[PDB]
Coordinates of C-alpha atoms in Angstrom, one line a residue:
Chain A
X1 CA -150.9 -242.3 -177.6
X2 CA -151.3 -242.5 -173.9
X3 CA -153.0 -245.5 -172.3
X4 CA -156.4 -244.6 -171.2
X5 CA -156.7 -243.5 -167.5
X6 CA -158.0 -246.5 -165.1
X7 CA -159.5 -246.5 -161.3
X8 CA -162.7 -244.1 -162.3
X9 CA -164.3 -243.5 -158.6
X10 CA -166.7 -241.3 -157.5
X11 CA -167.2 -240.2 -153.7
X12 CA -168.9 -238.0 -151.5
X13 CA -167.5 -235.6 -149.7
X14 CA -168.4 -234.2 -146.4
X15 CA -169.4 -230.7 -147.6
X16 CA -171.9 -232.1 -150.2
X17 CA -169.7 -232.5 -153.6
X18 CA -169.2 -235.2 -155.9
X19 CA -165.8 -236.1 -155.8
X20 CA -164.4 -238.2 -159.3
X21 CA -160.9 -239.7 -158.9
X22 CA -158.9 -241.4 -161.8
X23 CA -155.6 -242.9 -162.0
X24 CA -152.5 -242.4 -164.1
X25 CA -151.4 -245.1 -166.5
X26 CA -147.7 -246.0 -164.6
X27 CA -145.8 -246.0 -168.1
X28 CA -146.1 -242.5 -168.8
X29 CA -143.2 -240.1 -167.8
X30 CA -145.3 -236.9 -168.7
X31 CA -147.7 -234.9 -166.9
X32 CA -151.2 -235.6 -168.4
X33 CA -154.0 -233.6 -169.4
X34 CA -157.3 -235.0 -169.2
X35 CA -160.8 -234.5 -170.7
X36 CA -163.6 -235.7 -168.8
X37 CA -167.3 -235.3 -170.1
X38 CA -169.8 -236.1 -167.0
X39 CA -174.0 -236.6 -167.2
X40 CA -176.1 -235.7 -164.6
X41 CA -179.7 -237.3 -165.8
X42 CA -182.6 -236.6 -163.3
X43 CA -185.9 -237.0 -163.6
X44 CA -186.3 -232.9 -164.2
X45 CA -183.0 -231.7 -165.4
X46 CA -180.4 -233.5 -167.8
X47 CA -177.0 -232.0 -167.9
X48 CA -173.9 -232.9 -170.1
X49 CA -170.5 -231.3 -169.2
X50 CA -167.0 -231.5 -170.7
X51 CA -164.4 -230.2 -168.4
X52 CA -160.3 -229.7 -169.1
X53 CA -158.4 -230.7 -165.8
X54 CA -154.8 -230.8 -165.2
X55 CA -154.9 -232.8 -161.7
X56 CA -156.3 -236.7 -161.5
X57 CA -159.7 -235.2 -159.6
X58 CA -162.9 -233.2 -160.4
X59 CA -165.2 -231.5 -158.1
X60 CA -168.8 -231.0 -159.2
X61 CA -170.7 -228.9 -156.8
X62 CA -174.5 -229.8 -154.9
X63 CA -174.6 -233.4 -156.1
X64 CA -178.6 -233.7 -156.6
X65 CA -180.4 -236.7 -154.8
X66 CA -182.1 -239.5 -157.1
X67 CA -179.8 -238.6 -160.3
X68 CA -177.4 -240.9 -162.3
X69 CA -173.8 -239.6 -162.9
X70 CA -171.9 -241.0 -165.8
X71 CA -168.5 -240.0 -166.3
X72 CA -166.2 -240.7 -168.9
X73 CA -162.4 -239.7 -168.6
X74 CA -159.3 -239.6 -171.4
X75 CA -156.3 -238.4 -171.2
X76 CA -153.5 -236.4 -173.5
X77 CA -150.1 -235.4 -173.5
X78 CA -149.5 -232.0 -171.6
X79 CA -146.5 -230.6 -173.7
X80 CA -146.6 -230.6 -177.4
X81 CA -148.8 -232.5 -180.0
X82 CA -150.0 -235.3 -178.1
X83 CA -152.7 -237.5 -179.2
X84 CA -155.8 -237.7 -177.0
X85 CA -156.2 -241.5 -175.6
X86 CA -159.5 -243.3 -175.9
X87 CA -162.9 -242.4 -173.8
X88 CA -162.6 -244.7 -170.4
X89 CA -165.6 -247.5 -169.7
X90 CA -168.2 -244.9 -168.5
X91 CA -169.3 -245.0 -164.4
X92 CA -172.3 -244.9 -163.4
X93 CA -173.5 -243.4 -159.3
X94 CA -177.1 -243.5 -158.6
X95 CA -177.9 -241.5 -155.4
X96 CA -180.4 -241.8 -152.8
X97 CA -183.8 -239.7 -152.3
X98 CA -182.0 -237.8 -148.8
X99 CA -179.2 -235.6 -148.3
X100 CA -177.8 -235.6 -145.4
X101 CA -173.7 -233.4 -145.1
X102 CA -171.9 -234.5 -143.2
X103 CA -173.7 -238.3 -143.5
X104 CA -171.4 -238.7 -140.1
X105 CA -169.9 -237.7 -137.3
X106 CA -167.1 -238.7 -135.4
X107 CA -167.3 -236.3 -132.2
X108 CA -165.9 -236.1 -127.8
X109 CA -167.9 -235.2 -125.1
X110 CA -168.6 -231.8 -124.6
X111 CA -168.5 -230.7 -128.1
X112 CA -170.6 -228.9 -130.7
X113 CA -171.7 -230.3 -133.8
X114 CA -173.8 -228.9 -136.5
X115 CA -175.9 -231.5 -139.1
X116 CA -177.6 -229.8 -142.3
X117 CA -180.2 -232.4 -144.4
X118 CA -181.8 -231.4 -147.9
X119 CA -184.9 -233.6 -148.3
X120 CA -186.5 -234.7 -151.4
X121 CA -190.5 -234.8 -152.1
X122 CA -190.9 -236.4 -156.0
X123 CA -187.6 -234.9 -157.2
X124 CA -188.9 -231.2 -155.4
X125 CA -186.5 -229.8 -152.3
X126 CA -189.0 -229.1 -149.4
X127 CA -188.6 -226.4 -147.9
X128 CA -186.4 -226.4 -144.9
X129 CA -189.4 -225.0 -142.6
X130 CA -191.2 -228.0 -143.1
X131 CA -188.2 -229.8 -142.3
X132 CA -188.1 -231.5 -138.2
X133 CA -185.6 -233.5 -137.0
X134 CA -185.8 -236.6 -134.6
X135 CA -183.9 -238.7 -132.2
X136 CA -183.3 -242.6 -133.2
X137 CA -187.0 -241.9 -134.1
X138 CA -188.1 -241.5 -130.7
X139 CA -188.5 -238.0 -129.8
X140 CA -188.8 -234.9 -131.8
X141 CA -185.6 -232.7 -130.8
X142 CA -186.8 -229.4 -130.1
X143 CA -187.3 -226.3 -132.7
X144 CA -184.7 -224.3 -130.7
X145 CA -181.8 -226.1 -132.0
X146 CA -183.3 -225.7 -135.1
X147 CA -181.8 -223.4 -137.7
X148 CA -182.6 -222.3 -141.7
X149 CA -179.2 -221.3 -143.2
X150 CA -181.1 -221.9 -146.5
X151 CA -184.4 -222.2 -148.0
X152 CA -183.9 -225.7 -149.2
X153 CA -181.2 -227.0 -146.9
X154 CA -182.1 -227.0 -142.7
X155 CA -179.7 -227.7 -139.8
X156 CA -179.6 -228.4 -136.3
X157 CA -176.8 -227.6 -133.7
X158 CA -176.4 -229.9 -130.9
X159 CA -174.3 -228.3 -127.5
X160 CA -172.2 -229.8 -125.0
X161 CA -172.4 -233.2 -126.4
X162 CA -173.0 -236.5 -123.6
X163 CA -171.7 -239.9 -124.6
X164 CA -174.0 -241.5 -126.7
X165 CA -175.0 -244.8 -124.6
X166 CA -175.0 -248.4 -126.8
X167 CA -178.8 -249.2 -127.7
X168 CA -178.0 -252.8 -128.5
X169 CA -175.0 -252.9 -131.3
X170 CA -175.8 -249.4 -132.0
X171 CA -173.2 -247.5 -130.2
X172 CA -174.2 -244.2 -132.3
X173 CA -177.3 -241.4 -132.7
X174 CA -179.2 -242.1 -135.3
X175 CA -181.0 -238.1 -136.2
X176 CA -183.8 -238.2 -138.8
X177 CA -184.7 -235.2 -140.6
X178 CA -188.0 -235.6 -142.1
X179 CA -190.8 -233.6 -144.1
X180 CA -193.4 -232.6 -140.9
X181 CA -194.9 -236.2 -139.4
X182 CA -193.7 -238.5 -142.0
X183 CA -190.3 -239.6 -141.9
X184 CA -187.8 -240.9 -144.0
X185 CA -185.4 -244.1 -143.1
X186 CA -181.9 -242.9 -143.8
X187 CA -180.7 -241.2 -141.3
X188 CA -177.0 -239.4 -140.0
X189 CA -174.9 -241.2 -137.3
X190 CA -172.9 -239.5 -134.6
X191 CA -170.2 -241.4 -132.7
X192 CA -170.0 -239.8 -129.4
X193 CA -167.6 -242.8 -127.9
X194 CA -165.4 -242.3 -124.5
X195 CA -161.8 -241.5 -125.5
X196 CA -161.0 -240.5 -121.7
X197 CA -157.6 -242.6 -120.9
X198 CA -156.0 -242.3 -118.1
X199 CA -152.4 -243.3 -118.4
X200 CA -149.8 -243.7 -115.5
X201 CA -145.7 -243.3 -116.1
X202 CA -143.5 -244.9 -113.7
X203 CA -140.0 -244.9 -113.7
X204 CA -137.6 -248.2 -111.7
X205 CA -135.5 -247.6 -108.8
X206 CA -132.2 -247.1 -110.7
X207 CA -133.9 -244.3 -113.0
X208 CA -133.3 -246.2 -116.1
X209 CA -136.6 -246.7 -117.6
X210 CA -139.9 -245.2 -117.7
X211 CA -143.2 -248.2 -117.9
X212 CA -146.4 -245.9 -118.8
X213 CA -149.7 -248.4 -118.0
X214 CA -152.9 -247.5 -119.9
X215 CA -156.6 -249.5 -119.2
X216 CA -159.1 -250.2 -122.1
X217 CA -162.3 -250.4 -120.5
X218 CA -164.2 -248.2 -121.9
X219 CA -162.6 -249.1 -125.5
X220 CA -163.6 -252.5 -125.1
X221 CA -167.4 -252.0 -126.6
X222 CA -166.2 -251.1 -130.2
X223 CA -164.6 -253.6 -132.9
X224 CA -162.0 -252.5 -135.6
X225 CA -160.5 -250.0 -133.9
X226 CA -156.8 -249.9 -133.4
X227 CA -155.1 -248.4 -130.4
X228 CA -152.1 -246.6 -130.8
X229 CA -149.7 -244.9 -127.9
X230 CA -148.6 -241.7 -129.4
X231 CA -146.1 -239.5 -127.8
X232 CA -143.8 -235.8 -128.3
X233 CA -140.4 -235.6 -126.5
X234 CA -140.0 -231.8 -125.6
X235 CA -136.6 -230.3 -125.2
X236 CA -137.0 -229.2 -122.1
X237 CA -140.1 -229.5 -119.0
X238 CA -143.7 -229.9 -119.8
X239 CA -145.7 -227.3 -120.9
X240 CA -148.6 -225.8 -118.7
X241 CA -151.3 -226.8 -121.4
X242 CA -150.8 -230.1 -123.2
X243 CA -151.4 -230.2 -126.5
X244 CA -151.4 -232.8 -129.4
X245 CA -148.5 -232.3 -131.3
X246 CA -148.1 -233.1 -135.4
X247 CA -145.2 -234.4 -135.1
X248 CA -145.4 -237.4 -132.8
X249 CA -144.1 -241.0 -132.5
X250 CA -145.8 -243.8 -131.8
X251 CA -144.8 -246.6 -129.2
X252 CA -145.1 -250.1 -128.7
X253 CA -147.5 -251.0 -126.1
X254 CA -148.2 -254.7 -125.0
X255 CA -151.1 -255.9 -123.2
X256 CA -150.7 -257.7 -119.6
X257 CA -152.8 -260.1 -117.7
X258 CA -154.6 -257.6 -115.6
X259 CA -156.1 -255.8 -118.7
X260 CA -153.5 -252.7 -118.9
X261 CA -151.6 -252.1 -121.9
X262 CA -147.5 -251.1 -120.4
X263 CA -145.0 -249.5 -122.8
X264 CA -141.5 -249.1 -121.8
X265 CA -139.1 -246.4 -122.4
X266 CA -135.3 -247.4 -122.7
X267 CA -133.6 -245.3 -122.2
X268 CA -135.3 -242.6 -121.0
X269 CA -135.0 -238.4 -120.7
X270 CA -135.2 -237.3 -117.1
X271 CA -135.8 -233.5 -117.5
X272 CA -137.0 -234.0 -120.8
X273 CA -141.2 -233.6 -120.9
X274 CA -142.9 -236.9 -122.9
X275 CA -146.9 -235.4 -124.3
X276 CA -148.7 -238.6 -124.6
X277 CA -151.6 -239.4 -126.1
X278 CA -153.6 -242.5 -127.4
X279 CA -155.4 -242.2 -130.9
X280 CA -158.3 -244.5 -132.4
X281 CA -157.7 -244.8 -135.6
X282 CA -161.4 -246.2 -136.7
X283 CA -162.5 -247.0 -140.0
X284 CA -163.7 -243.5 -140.9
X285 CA -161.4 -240.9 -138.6
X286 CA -159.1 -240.5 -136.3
X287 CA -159.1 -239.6 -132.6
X288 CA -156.8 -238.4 -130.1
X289 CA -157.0 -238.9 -126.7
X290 CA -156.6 -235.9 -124.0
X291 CA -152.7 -235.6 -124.0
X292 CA -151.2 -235.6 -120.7
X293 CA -147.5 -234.6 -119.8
X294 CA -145.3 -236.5 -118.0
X295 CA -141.1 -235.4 -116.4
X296 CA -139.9 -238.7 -115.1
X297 CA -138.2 -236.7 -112.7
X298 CA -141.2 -235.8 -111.1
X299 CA -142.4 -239.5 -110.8
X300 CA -140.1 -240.6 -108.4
X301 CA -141.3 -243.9 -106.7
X302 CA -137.9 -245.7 -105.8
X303 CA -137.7 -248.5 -103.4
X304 CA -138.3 -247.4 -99.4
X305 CA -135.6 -247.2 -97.2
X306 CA -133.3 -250.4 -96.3
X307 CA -131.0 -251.6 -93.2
X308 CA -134.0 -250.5 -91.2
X309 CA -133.1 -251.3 -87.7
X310 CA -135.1 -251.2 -84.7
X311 CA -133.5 -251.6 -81.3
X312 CA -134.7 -250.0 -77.8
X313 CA -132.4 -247.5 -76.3
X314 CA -130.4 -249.2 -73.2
X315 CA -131.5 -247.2 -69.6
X316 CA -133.7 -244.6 -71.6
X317 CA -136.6 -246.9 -72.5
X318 CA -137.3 -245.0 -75.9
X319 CA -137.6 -247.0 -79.2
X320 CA -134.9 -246.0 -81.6
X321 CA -135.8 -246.7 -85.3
X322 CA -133.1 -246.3 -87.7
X323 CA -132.6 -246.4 -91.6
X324 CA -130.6 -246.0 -94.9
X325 CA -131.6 -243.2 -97.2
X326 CA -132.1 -244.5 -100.8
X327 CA -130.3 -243.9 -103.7
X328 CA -133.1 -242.2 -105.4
X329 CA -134.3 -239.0 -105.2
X330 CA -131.6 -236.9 -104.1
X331 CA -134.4 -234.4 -103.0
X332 CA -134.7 -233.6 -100.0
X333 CA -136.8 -236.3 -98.1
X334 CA -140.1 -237.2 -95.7
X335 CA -140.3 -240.5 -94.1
X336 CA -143.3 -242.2 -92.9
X337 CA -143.2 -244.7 -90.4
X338 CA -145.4 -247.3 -88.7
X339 CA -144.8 -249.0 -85.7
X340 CA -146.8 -251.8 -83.4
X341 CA -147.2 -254.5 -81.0
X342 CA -146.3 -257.5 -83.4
X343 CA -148.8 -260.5 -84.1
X344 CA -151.3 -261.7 -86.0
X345 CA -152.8 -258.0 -86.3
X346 CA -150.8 -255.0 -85.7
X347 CA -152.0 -252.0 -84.6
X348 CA -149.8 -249.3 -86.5
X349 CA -149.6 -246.5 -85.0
X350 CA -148.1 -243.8 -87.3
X351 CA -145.3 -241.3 -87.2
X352 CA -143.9 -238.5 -89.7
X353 CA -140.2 -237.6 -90.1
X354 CA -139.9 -234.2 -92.2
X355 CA -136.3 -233.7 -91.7
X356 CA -134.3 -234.3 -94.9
X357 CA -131.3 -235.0 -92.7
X358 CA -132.9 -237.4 -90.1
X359 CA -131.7 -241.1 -90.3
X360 CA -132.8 -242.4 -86.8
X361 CA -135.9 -241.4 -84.3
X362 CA -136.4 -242.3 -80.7
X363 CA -140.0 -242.7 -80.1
X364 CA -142.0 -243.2 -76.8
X365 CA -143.5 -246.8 -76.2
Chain B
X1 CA -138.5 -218.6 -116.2
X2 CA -137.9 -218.8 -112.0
X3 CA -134.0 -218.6 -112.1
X4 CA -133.7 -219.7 -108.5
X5 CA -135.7 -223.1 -109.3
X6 CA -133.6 -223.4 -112.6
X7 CA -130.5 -223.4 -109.7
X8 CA -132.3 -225.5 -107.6
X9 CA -133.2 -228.4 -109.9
X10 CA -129.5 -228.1 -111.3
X11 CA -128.1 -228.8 -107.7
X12 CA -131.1 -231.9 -107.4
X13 CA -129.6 -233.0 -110.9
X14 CA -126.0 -232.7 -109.8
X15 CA -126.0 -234.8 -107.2
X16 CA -128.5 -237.5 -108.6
X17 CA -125.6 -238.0 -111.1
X18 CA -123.2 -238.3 -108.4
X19 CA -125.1 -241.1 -106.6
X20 CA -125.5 -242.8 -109.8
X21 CA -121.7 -242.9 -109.7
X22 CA -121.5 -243.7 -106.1
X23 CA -124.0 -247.2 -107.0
X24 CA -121.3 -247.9 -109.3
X25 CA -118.9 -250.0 -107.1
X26 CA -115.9 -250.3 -109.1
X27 CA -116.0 -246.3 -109.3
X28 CA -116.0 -245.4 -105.7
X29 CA -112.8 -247.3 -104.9
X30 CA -110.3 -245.5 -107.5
X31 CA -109.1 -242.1 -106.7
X32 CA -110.7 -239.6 -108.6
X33 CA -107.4 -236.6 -108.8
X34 CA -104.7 -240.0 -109.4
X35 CA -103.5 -239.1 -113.0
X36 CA -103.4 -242.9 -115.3
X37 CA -101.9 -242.3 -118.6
X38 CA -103.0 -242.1 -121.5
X39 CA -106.8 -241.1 -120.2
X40 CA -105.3 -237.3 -120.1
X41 CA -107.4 -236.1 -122.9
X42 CA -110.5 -236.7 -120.8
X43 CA -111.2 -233.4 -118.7
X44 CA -110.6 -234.0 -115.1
X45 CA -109.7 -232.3 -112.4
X46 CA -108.3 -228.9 -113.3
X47 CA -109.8 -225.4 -112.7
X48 CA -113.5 -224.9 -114.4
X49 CA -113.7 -221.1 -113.6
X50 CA -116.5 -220.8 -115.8
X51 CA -119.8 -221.2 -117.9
X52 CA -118.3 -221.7 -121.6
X53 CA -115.4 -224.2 -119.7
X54 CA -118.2 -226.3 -118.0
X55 CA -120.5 -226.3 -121.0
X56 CA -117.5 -227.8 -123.4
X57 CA -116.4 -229.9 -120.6
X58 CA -120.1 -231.7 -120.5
X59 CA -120.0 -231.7 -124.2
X60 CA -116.7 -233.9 -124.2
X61 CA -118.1 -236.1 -121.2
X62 CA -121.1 -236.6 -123.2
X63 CA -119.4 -237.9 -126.5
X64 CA -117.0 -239.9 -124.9
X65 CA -119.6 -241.7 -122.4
X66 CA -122.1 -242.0 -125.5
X67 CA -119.2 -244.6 -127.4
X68 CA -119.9 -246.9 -124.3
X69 CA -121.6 -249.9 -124.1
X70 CA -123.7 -249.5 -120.4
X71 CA -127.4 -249.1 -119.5
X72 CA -126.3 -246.8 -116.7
X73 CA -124.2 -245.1 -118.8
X74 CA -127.1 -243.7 -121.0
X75 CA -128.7 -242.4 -118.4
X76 CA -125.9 -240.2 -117.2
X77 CA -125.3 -239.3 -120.6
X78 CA -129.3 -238.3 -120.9
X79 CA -128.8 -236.7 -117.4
X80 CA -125.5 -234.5 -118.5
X81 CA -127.8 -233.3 -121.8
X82 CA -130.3 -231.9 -119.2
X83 CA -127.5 -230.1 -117.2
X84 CA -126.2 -228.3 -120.5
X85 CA -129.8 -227.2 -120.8
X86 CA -130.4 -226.1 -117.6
X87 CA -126.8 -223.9 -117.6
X88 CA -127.8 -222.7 -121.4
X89 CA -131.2 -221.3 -119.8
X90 CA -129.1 -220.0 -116.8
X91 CA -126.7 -218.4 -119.4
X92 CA -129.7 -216.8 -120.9
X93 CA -131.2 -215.6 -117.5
X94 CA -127.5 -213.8 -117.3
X95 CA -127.8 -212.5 -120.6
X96 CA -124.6 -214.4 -121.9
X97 CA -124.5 -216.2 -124.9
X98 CA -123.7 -219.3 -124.8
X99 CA -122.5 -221.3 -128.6
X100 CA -123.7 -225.3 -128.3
X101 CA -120.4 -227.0 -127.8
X102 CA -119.7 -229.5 -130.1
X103 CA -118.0 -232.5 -128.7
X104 CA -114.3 -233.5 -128.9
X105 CA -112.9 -233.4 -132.7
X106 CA -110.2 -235.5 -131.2
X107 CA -111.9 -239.0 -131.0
X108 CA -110.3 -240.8 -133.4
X109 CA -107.8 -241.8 -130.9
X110 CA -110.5 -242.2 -128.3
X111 CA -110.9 -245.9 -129.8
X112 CA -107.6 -246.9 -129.2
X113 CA -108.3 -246.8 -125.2
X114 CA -111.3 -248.6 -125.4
X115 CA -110.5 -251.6 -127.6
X116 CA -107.0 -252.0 -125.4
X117 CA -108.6 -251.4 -122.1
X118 CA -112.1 -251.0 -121.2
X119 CA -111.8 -251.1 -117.7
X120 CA -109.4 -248.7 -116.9
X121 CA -111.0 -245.9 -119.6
X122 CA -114.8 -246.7 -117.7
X123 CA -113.3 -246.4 -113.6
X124 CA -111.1 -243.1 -115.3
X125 CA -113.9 -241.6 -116.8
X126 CA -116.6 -242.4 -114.4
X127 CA -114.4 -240.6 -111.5
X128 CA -113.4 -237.7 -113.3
X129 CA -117.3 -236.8 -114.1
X130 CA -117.5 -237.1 -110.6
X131 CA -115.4 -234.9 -109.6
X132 CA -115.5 -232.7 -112.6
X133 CA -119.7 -232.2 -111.0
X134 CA -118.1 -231.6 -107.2
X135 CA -115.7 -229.1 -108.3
X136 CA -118.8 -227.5 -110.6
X137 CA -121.2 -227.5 -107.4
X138 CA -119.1 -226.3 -105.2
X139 CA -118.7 -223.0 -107.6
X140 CA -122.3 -222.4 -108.2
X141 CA -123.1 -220.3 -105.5
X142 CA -119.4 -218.8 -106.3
X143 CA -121.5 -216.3 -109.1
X144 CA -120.4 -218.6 -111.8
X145 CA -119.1 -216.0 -115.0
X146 CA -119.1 -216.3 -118.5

């Protein structure tokens, strides 16, 4: 005789089902079998149901607002004779009056997203052309985004999203569907939040490592959310369209005293593109930020020229200005130069070298 | 896939490397063809006529600079992968088929060197890769065979 099954939850889902979770007892090497006999009591209908499940969860379909769910779970052996384990201590989930699926949002800029709302009048679905839909109740949103997929359940369909600005500590949309004038005070909540980061690779002067430097202004008005570099190593170049990649790794980015998170890269891949991207992970979802490629070998910064010498040519009156090619790149090479009266200010007056094989330039002063 | 920017970046590469070495001033002062033995199982200077050679030769200077303990020594070792790459693609763009060359099987005496003497298996194998990427430059405009 199996031990009862324990951790009886029940959950929402985002398409509008009642999702009941249980547990396995952790002394059981067998597979289990379990019996689970839910009631859905309303104020109208009253349901009992006994249902035969292999797996730890149960769906049940159009969870009805204002109703109590009590379930009851036990559990048996799946191969042979086994002997059916007591009933669990029954759960109880009492629902709200509204129904609104998805209840939230998490959404970019730019995007579409769709919000359907079943709404309850004394246990009767209105109809969904009675149903209008409003703004942090401040402004009716227009019957053009409105849309009956149903007869009982109504939608709306917002287009090319803007960022939701913070009204106080609100930093999300509250949208209201409501029978004609009167309105209700639940309400569905769309997170349109700024996930545009701009990060900047940089390699050293000897090619060895690769510091990438990211800001977190516009991350700075949410709490609880965690900031994570994520990044894909390709075999070979970037890609012409970034993408997010499933398999990625993340990095270990610290924060310095002008505000800009740098993560270093030791060793690092020369030819070799890095895809990286930052992800929120908040409490409910995930985002990724706009990946961006970077080849080190493309970000070539090193260190300007040295043993920069500049003399004026004996009997020919022309300033020669000489130099030392770097180490790094081997490309081939501009130089820029500026040269002035020297003082307090000088006015530089500026020149542009764009042989590769040019080390020294006589100039007219 | 451009095959004359393929060459192009592979001569860029080439000679990145070969500054890399020429930073390294304990490298520049040995002679690069001067035979030291007991270093002869690294592959230096002797004729690389083509594709498959160079390939297995970058394969062996790969796992032999990997054992090392240097910072700039990753790097070339990181740099040499993306030169296999870029003469696999190349191989390709010929329509020869190129096998990924495993390294040396032949490092179990590899050790020996470097626990004895560090120095002289670092200046020796430094130089050779060197001039093992001269000779190789100097042949790719050649029309490098497989």
């Amino acid at each position: 005789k199996p031990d009862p099954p324990l951790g009886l939850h029940m959950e929402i889902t985002d398409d509008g089902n009642l999702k009941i979770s249980w547990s396995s007892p952790p002394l059981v090497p067998f597979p289990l079998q379990y019996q689970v006999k839910y009631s859905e009591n309303s104020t109208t209908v009253i349901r009992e149901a006994d249902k035969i499940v292999s797996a730890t969860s149960l769906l049940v379909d159009s969870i009805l607002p204002g109703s109590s769910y009590e379930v009851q779970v036990r559990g048996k052996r799946l191969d042979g004779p086994g002997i059916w384990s007591d009933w669990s201590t029954p759960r109880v989930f009492t629902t709200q009056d509204v129904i609104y699926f998805p209840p939230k949002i998490l959404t970019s800029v730019g995007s579409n997203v769709s919000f359907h709302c079943i709404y309850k009048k004394e246990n009767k679905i209105v109809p969904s052309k009675e149903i209008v839909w409003w703004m942090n109740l401040a402004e009716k949103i227009p019957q053009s985004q409105y849309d009956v997929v149903s007869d009982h359940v109504s939608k709306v369909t917002f287009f090319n999203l803007n960022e939701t600005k913070p009204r106080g500590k609100f930093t999300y949309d509250a949208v209201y569907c409501c029978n004609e004038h009167e309105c209700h005070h639940r309400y569905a909540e769309l997170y349109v939040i700024d996930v545009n980061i701009n990060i900047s690779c940089e390699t050293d002067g000897y090619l060895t490592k690769m510091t990438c430097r990211w800001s977190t202004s516009t991350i700075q008005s949410l709490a609880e959310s965690t900031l994570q570099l994520r990044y894909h190593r390709s075999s070979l170049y970037c890609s012409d369209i970034p993408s997010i990649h499933p398999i990625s790794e993340p990095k270990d980015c610290y924060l310095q005293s002008d505000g800009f998170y740098e993560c270093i890269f030791q060793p690092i891949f020369l030819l070799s593109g890095y895809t990286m991207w930052i992800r929120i992970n908040h409490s409910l979802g995930s985002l990724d930020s706009p990946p961006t490629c970077v080849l080190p070998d493309s970000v070539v910064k090193p260190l300007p020229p040295s043993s920069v010498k500049a003399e004026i040519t004996i009997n020919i009156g022309l300033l020669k200005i000489s130099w030392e090619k770097p180490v790094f790149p081997e490309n081939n090479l501009q130089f820029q130069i500026r040269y002035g009266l020297s003082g307090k200010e000088v006015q530089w007056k500026m020149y542009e070298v764009y042989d590769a094989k040019s080390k020294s330039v006589s100039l007219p002063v | 896939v451009p095959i004359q920017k393929v060459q192009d970046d592979t001569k860029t590469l080439i000679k990145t490397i070969v500054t890399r070495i020429n930073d390294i001033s304990h490298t520049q002062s040995v002679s690069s063809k001067q035979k030291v033995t007991g270093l002869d199982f690294i592959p230096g200077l002797h004729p690389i006529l083509t594709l498959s050679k160079m390939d297995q030769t970058l394969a062996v200077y790969q796992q032999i600079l990997t054992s090392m303990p240097s910072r700039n020594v990753i790097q070339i070792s990181n740099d040499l992968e993306n030169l296999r790459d870029l003469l696999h693609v190349l191989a390709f763009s010929k329509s020869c088929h190129l096998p990924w060359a495993s390294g040396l099987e032949t490092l179990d005496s590899l050790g020996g060197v470097l626990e004895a003497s560090g120095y002289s298996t670092e200046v020796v194998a430094l130089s050779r890769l060197q001039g093992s990427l001269q000779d190789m430059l100097w042949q790719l405009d050649l029309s490098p065979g497989c």
